[PDB]
Amino acid sequence: MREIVHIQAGQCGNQIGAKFWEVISDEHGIDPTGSYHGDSDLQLERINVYYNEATGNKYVPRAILVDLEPGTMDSVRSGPFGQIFRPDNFVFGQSGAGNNWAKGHYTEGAELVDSVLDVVRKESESCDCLQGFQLTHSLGGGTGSGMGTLLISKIREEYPDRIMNTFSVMPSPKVSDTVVEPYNATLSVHQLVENTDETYCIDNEALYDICFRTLKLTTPTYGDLNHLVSATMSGVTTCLRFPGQLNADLRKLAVNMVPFPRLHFFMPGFAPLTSRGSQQYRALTVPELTQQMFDSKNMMAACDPRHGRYLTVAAIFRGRMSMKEVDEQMLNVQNKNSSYFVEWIPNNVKTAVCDIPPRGLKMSATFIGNSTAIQELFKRISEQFTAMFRRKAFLHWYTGEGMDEMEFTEAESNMNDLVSEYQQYQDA
Amino acid sequence: MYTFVVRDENSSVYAEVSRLLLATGQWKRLRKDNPRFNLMLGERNRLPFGRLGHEPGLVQLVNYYRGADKLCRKASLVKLIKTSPELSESCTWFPESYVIYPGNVWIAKISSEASELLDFIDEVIQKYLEKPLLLEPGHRKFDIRSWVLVDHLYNIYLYREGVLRTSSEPYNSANFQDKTCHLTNHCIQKEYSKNYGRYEEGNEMFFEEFNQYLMDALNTTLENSILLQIKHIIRSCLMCIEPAISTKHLHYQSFQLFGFDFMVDEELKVWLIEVNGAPACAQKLYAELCQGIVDVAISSVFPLATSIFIKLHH
Amino acid sequence: MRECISIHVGQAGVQIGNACWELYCLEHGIQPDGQMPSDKTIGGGDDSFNTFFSETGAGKHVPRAVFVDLEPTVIDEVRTGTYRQLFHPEQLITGKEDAANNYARGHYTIGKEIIDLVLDRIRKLADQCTGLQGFLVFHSFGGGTGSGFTSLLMERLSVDYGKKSKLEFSIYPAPQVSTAVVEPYNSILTTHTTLEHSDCAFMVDNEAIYDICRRNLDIERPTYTNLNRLISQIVSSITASLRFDGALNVDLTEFQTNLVPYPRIHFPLATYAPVISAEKAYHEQLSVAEITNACFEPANQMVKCDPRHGKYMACCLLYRGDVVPKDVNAAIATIKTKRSIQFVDWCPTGFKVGINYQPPTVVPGGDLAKVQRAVCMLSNTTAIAEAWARLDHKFDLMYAKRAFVHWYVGEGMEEGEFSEAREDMAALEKDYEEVGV
Amino acid sequence: MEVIELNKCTSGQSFEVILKPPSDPSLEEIQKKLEAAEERRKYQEAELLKHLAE
Numbered sequence A: 001m002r003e004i005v006h007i008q009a010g011q012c013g014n015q016i017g018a019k020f021w022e023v024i025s026d027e028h029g030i031d032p033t034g035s036y037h038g039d040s041d042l043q044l045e046r047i048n049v050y051y052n053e054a055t056g057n058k059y060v061p062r063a064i065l066v067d068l069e070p071g072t073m074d075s076v077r078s079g080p081f082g083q084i085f086r087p088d089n090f091v092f093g094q095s096g097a098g099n100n101w102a103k104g105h106y107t108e109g110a111e112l113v114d115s116v117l118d119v120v121r122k123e124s125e126s127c128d129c130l131q132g133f134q135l136t137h138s139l140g141g142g143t144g145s146g147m148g149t150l151l152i153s154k155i156r157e158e159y160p161d162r163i164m165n166t167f168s169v170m171p172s173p174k175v176s177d178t179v180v181e182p183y184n185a186t187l188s189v190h191q192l193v194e195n196t197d198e199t200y201c202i203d204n205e206a207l208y209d210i211c212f213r214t215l216k217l218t219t220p221t222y223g224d225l226n227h228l229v230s231a232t233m234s235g236v237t238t239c240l241r242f243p244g245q246l247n248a249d250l251r252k253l254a255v256n257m258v259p260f261p262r263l264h265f266f267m268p269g270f271a272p273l274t275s276r277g278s279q280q281y282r283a284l285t286v287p288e289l290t291q292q293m294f295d296s297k298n299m300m301a302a303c304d305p306r307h308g309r310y311l312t313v314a315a316i317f318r319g320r321m322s323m324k325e326v327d328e329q330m331l332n333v334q335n336k337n338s339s340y341f342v343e344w345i346p347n348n349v350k351t352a353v354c355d356i357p358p359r360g361l362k363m364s365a366t367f368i369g370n371s372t373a374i375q376e377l378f379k380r381i382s383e384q385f386t387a388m389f390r391r392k393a394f395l396h397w398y399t400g401e402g403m404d405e406m407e408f409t410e411a412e413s414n415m416n417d418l419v420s421e422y423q424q425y426q427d428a
Numbered sequence B: 001m002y003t004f005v006v007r008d009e010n011s012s013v014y015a016e017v018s019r020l021l022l023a024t025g026q027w028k029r030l031r032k033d034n035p036r037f038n039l040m041l042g043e044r045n046r047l048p049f050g051r052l053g054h055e056p057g058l059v060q061l062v063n064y065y066r067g068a069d070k071l072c073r074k075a076s077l078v079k080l081i082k083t084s085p086e087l088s089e090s091c092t093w094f095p096e097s098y099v100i101y102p103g104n105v106w107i108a109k110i111s112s113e114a115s116e117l118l119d120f121i122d123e124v125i126q127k128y129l130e131k132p133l134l135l136e137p138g139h140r141k142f143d144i145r146s147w148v149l150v151d152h153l154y155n156i157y158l159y160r161e162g163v164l165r166t167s168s169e170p171y172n173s174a175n176f177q178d179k180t181c182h183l184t185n186h187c188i189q190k191e192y193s194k195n196y197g198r199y200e201e202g203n204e205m206f207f208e209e210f211n212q213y214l215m216d217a218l219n220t221t222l223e224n225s226i227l228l229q230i231k232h233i234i235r236s237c238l239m240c241i242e243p244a245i246s247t248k249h250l251h252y253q254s255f256q257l258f259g260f261d262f263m264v265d266e267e268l269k270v271w272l273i274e275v276n277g278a279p280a281c282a283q284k285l286y287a288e289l290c291q292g293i294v295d296v297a298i299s300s301v302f303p304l305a306t307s308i309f310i311k312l313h314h
Numbered sequence C: 001m002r003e004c005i006s007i008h009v010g011q012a013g014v015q016i017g018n019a020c021w022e023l024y025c026l027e028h029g030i031q032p033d034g035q036m037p038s039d040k041t042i043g044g045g046d047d048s049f050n051t052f053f054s055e056t057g058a059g060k061h062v063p064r065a066v067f068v069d070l071e072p073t074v075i076d077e078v079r080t081g082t083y084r085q086l087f088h089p090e091q092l093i094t095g096k097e098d099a100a101n102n103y104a105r106g107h108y109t110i111g112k113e114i115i116d117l118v119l120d121r122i123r124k125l126a127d128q129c130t131g132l133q134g135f136l137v138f139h140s141f142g143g144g145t146g147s148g149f150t151s152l153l154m155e156r157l158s159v160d161y162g163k164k165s166k167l168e169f170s171i172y173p174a175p176q177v178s179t180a181v182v183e184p185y186n187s188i189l190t191t192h193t194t195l196e197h198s199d200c201a202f203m204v205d206n207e208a209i210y211d212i213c214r215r216n217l218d219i220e221r222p223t224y225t226n227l228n229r230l231i232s233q234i235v236s237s238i239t240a241s242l243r244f245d246g247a248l249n250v251d252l253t254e255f256q257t258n259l260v261p262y263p264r265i266h267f268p269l270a271t272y273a274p275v276i277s278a279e280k281a282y283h284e285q286l287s288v289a290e291i292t293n294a295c296f297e298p299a300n301q302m303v304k305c306d307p308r309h310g311k312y313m314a315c316c317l318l319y320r321g322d323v324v325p326k327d328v329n330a331a332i333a334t335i336k337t338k339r340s341i342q343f344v345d346w347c348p349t350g351f352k353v354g355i356n357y358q359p360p361t362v363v364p365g366g367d368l369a370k371v372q373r374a375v376c377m378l379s380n381t382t383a384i385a386e387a388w389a390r391l392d393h394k395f396d397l398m399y400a401k402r403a404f405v406h407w408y409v410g411e412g413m414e415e416g417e418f419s420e421a422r423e424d425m426a427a428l429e430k431d432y433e434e435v436g437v
Numbered sequence D: 001m002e003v004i005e006l007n008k009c010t011s012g013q014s015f016e017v018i019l020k021p022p023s024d025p026s027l028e029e030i031q032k033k034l035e036a037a038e039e040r041r042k043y044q045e046a047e048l049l050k051h052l053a054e
């Protein structure tokens, strides 16, 4: 269990994917040219999980960039770390997906999927022990949601014994591009329920609410939202790419976090919540990190943890701090929220600490929760789906691509089944 | 914010303790099966002592002493006293008793013929106190109930307030089938006595009255004539089993409330009858006793943000 | 002389084995390069220490051990560690990916492909043995490899070595030092499958070792190295009779005879004393009576339980250092009247005593201080059933909802094996209650 | 208390103190289990591929 294959598809997938690679590249001391200029060998002990090596001692991210139009991927090349990516790993079309799940999943995307799989196959053939795949994408568009899930289904067919991990951005009217996003998300969620082992639910509604309410940003941009996604992606992957007490891998993660196959959608949280470019002078105490990361205002999924119950919980601390104080503060937040943990999964809270702090923060904490309160997110999407679907509004964009109404009815039923499944374990 | 769980809904005493703990604003009640508790008000049977004291970062306390059953079972108490050198077979405050598997007046748990009692057992045998101290007016029998609290440090606290459980019907040596004048239990006197409640309310006389009567009737006091023996009997029983039930070096801690029942004969000699591990309290004394448990048995381990007991040093 | 082969499985068994064989070398004067000057018979010998070490023509003493882990990270440190030369490469066996904390993955899926290789390497050590006694197996309950692969190996060893004894050193799971949430599952699955194949198993509760390090060693946050050096001391005391001249527990068969009257109830409770911090430069050396009394204090046991509420089936006192029988008998007499030790009626109330004059050895620069005398008590008491009840209850809480079960069924394992394993554990708990209640 | 079976040598001595007297499957069956499990995996994976084919 060593290398992970990264995949980013669509506009949102590639923008958050690009930000993820320039953030961890800095943490590991890799510059935009792919050469290491760090000071600690702990930056390279497990560098092969996300990076390959080449002659001249260069590290190339094991990443594949996918999109049906060139726009966003042209941005990546001209980006800060755009040159680190292997040029052959750029696979893009010209027609686009028009924010249409059908176009990405059945028509336009079907035309391009095989060439993406050829790149995936080439990356896997070089792996000494492939853990699986991590995919970044949105669910409200066409390429990321439609073609992203088509890739997931076809990747599982070829690699049924590898872990599938995704960072999936949920749509929100507060930050919406099109009115059909509830359609694209509902169709995608069903795919994720069947063909992923772990999915980090990154809710654009929570990202917006955090920027507006907490960060005091009157009009947040996608850059401000991706600043929160960037910090969370670094946090939840720290234990995969750095040596520490917990040398995590994708399979052990799923075994310990997912008690039931379909309930593999995680609520991410981060602390302290910070604005881009705004330097924080006062570092947080361990009690503050613990209280915030369990606070509903720090959740990256617009759900109230108090409305449900935790099946499994993981907290990763970064920086030089007192483990004894970490242990004491964890036991005390568990006591305050003692009513919100299931009693039929003993010792369902995992604590990990990494000594290397992320850029700009002397210590931080990343929250990873498998809470039944995540049903509020899927219920919100369902209501928005049903509101349009009961009148078949905007359905012609999809039937024009070969889809039938029955497929929508099935997606609606599947998600309501998912919601009811979370509800039964919330009353257990 | 301390946490506790309730596993004996029928305990009136700890139902009151549970009420006080909640009123402090610093205690939180969890579901009866949540393992993350600081205090456990356990059940009367098969209490899972083996699961206590294994929760990281939690100091755990329970309101029962594992192994205290040897003292609160009639058959076990007799074997404990006979086979323990500290108590001995020459013990002078425990009536002669014998274990049997299925003046010469005896009681089984009342007959003067051995074959009558042995047939009933097949259908503990203890010497019956034929000369018991009799209250007046009334010429009536009684027994004394003493509440004792033992904390995690094994301090022996005797509640200053005791109760006398009296027989409304005057005592009679002639017929042992009367029973209502031979058995002092509160429940029986309610359903077998027309005289129930004539002298003292609910057949419950408290110490201030009993002390006064002893002074007027016998020119003595309760402390000198009875309480010295009671305090000695309590100290002797609990010190005997201390090495077997102490939680001084255990991963969990125990405290327990005991109900000692004594008898007093005509010569002002106190006899031990039995010990109860899950005793009920007197109606008037619930408020004071239950707060006393929280003061010395709970808050001593879990502090918050004159004494009603008598510490029996040992 | 009869040889003993040690088998270390999974991370816990491997790292604990490192501590044990490090302590063995210090006790026997064997240097990291395998050279043992005090051995005047070069290339051969019938001594007691030859039970755990074979000799090469060059005078190298190599452990009769095999290290197995499905993942290579842990054993790689043994390949590059200070004792790299001690073992030959064929003794260290590793795969590529671990069992992912999944018993079924270690027993059925990933273990099926490496079981034959391991048996072949074990057969290579057995062929250098004139009179093999049996095996000492070190493993954890909670790990996927420690539980899943061990049970598979135990099954095969019974087939290929029907006449040889097998003793276990098992790490009982504790949330203070846990790694997986499914450790209760793995513990029950491996106990059920290994029960009929293990003659005597010494359980060590990580919780007990953790607290002993904090209280007696003043180590706030004990590490695996701290836990393992204390564990190796206990293991050393238990195996000392096999490696030194003596008369008590001279061969593995004696462990079952002296400690296991009922085969299924084969989990002796280990108590050790004293554990003194090396930081203190001044501690007063405890007497024979003081260390013998400590063996009846719950805080010194490898598994936290209350021996006062159980029945004894056998008791063994293993002393090391300045100890004479006169003092031992005096201490026993005192303790028997100050504490209530109740044996089963069909068992004689007695103690088998063993004294080794050589004081306990400590790793240089460790946290354990040198003492003039120490004692390890092995008592087969029904009180250890408390640990089974604790573990079975956690199992019940999760299994009632079938939580995480799909990970096991996905590896080819059936759901009926969960209930089958739990029922065997229920029978095990009744056996304890019938013997000591 | 009686001390019995006192053995002595250079490395130490052992004895016993009495305070009171008293009052497998074959390799065939293993394969039948391991191959039975591997077949249940093959079946479950065949169902997955079949489901993906639809």
Ligand SMILES: Nc1nc2c(ncn2[C@@H]2O[C@H](COP(=O)(O)OP(=O)(O)OP(=O)(O)O)[C@@H](O)[C@H]2O)c(=O)[nH]1
Pocket: C009, C010, C011, C012, C013, C015, C016, C069, C070, C071, C098, C099, C100, C101, C102, C106, C140, C141, C142, C143, C144, C145, C146, C147, C171, C172, C173, C174, C177, C178, C179, C180, C183, C206, C224, C225, C227, C228, C231
């Ligand atoms: N005392 C002690 N316990 C350990 C040690 N290493 C792991 N453990 C315990 O073992 C349990 C986990 O099993 P592991 O041995 O780590 O897992 P494994 O055998 O390598 O199997 P995999 O899951 O495939 O990695 C946890 O309960 C740990 O507390 C150790 O070095 N010393």
Ligand SMILES: Nc1ncnc2c1ncn2[C@@H]1O[C@H](COP(=O)(O)OP(=O)(O)CP(=O)(O)O)[C@@H](O)[C@H]1O
Pocket: B095, B107, B109, B126, B127, B128, B129, B142, B143, B182, B183, B184, B185, B261, B263, B273, B274, B276
């Ligand atoms: N040896 C004896 N001599 C005289 N009276 C006796 C006696 N043994 C029992 N009694 C009478 O029987 C009454 C109750 O007997 P017992 O010891 O069983 O109390 P009990 O268990 O029935 C209810 P409680 O728990 O409230 O005491 C005593 O209060 C006393 O009046």
Ligand SMILES: Nc1nc2c(ncn2[C@@H]2O[C@H](COP(=O)(O)OP(=O)(O)O)[C@@H](O)[C@H]2O)c(=O)[nH]1
Pocket: A009, A010, A011, A012, A013, A015, A016, A097, A098, A099, A100, A138, A139, A140, A141, A142, A143, A144, A145, A169, A170, A171, A172, A175, A176, A177, A181, A204, A207, A222, A223, A225, A226, A229
């Ligand atoms: N957080 C975040 N969300 C985005 C970003 N870009 C697009 N989205 C969201 O993704 C959805 C649109 O999908 P998009 O990726 O643009 O379409 P695609 O190119 O077909 O995959 C909308 O719900 C947007 O709110 C981004 O950079 N950050």
Ligand SMILES: Cc1ccnc(Nc2ccc([N+](=O)[O-])c(NCCN3CCOCC3)n2)c1
Pocket: A235, A236, A237, A238, A239, A240, A246, A247, A248, A249, A250, A251, A252, A253, A254, A256, A257, A312, A313, A314, A315, A316, A347, A348, A349, A350, A352, A368, C178, C179, C180, C181
């Ligand atoms: C709930 C829980 C309770 C008890 N024990 C664990 N044990 C465990 C063992 C291995 C891994 N592992 O991931 O390998 C793991 N993952 C936890 C989530 N991780 C996500 C990525 O960041 C690091 C944290 N948990 C987990």
Ligand SMILES: [Ca+2]
Pocket: A108, A111
């Ligand atoms: Ca086309």
Ligand SMILES: [Ca+2]
Pocket: C039, C040, C041, C042, C043, C044, C045, C046, C055
């Ligand atoms: Ca030799």
Ligand SMILES: [Mg+2]
Pocket: A011, A141
């Ligand atoms: Mg777009």
Ligand SMILES: [Mg+2]
Pocket: B274, B276
């Ligand atoms: Mg009674």
Ligand SMILES: [Mg+2]
Pocket: C010, C011, C071, C098, C143, C145
């Ligand atoms: Mg391992």
